[PDB]
Amino acid sequence: NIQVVVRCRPFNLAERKASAHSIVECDPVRKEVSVRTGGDKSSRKTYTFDMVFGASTKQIDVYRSVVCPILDEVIMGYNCTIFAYGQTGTGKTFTMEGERSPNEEYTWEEDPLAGIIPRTLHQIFEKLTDNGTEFSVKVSLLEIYNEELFDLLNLQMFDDPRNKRGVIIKGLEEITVHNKDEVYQILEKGAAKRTTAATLMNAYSSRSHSVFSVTIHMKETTIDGEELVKIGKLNLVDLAGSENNINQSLLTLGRVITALVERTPHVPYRESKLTRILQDSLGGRTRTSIIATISPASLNLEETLSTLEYAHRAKNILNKP
């Protein structure tokens, strides 16, 4: 139930300035990433994943391929989580949040540069208004920095007495999003925050986990007129940069993912703030996906191999001859 995909972004100008060369070749059809490792010429390691998106990949492609099937499961009343993992500067935030094309050329709903979070919020309204039923949508956004919780929309964690796998975050702002106009407003506010953030703030962010949670309450009425409510939650997690001190939440999440994939009887959720928060959306019926982001440039060989080695172990798929 854990999908692992790789997304490689295009070369950037910093990498061209450094005179780096391309060491990554992506093959979306074979689902492979091959990396030149010798600096050598023939030295090469190949990894196989569930999906591989190369540099030309559009935001809408990632959304349709990765998120849509997961959203469908959330709408059935399950809790699911999608992660972006990788070195700082490789595309975690672009993938999760994306951005607005310059000059207001598009609405957020239609913008080709919008990422997973804005697309998910728009699709929830689409999918459920055309479904015909009554529903509400709430969002929260929290940051985990140095094993402490911060509310990005405005904290203390306690186990939830009415949910053996869940926690209650005291004081966390959960805002109702009533329509698509309110979606636009939250996105405009977030972009303003990103755009005007000082350098120290961006830096903090590169070392922090961001957890955007959308909770959907869906009402049905049995034939005789009884009201029933089901709840689905989708956590969209932009992880701290993976480059090498040790991030306790990231190491703990890795261990949790390993325990889940290997069917280790003890899954160490309690060992970190992040994994306690995500416990109720990990390990169960639920679809989980990890999007591992990488750079194609030679400058980043060590960090790219680190990411690929981890992601490969998390899925372990044998290369097809």
Ligand X SMILES: COc1ccc(/N=c2\[nH]c3cc(C(=O)O)ccc3n2Cc2ccccc2C(F)(F)F)cc1F
Q: 129 labelled as ligand-binding?
A: no
Binding-residue pattern over the window 180 to 209 for ligand ADP, x denoting contact by CB under 6 A: --------------------------x---
Q: How many CB atoms within 10 Å of residue 293?
A: 28
Contact by Cβ (8 Å): 248, 226: no
Which of 16, 44, 193, 285 touches ligand X by CB under 6 A?
A: 193
| Largest pairwise CA distance in the chain | 74
Please tell me whether residue 10 binds ligand ADP under the rule CB under 6 A: yes
> Residue 34 binds which entry of ligand X, Mg ion, ligand ADP, none, with Cβ cut-offs from 5 to 8 Å by kind?
none
Partner whose binding site includes residue 10, from Mg ion, ligand ADP, ligand X, none (CB under 5 to 8 Å by kind): ligand ADP
| Helix (H), strand (E) at residue 184 | helix 180-196
Give the integer Cα–Cα distance in Å for 114 and 100: 6
Gaps in the chain (C to N distance exceeding 2.5 A) after? 39, 154, 244
Based on the shown chain and the rule CB under 5 A, indicate whether residue 93 belongs to the binding site for Mg ion: yes
Out of ligand X, Mg ion, ligand ADP, none, which partner does residue 9 contact, by CB within 5 to 8 A per kind?
A: ligand ADP
Render the burial of 42-57: b for 16+ CB within 10 Å, e for the rest.
eeeeebbbbbbbbeeb
Output 92 or 255, the one with its CB closest to Mg ion.
Answer: 92
* Residues of span 276-305 touching ligand ADP by CB under 6 A: 293
Residue 133 counted as an annotated binding residue: no
> CB within 8 A of 56, min separation 6: which ones?
10
279 neighbors 167 (Cβ within 8 angstroms): yes
**Interacting residues of 77 by C-beta distance below 8 A, sequence separation 6+:** 218, 230, 231, 232
By the rule CB under 6 A, 290 interacts with ligand X: yes
For residues 79 to 98, the per-residue mask of contacts with ligand ADP, x marking binding by CB under 6 A and - elsewhere, is: -------x-xxxxxxx----
Q: What is the DSSP letter of 66?
A: I
Q: Enter the tokens of residue 219.
A: 């009402």
The torsion angles phi and psi of 188, rounded to 5 degrees, stand at -60, -40
Cβ distance to ligand X smaller for residue 167 or 305: 305
Choose which of 29, 228, 246, 318 interacts with ligand X (CB under 6 A).
246
Pick what 48 binds: ligand ADP, Mg ion, ligand X, none; C-beta below 5 to 8 Å, kind-dependent: none
Which of 202, 221, 264, 316 touches ligand X (CB under 6 A)? 202
CB of 90 to ligand ADP, least distance (A): 5
118 binds ligand X per the rule CB under 6 A: yes
Q: What is d(CA 260, CA 264) in angstroms, rounded to the nearest whole number?
A: 7
Q: Residue 54: which of 72, 32, 76 has the closest Cα?
A: 32
Rounded CA separation 207/92 (Å):
12
Q: Which is nearer to ligand X, 64 or 219 (CB)?
A: 64
Provide the minimum distance between the beta carbon of 213 and Mg ion in the complex, in angstroms, as a whole number: 18
Cα separation, 52 vs 21, in Å, equals 20
In the annotated binding site for ATP, the residues are 86-93
Question: Which parts of this chain interact with ligand ADP (CB under 6 A)?
Answer: 9-10, 86, 88-94, 206, 293
Write out the residues near ligand X by the rule CB under 6 A. Answer: 83, 85, 97, 117-118, 141, 152-153, 186-187, 189-191, 193-194, 197, 201-202, 205, 210, 212, 242, 244, 246-247, 250-251, 253-255, 257-258, 290, 292, 310-311, 314
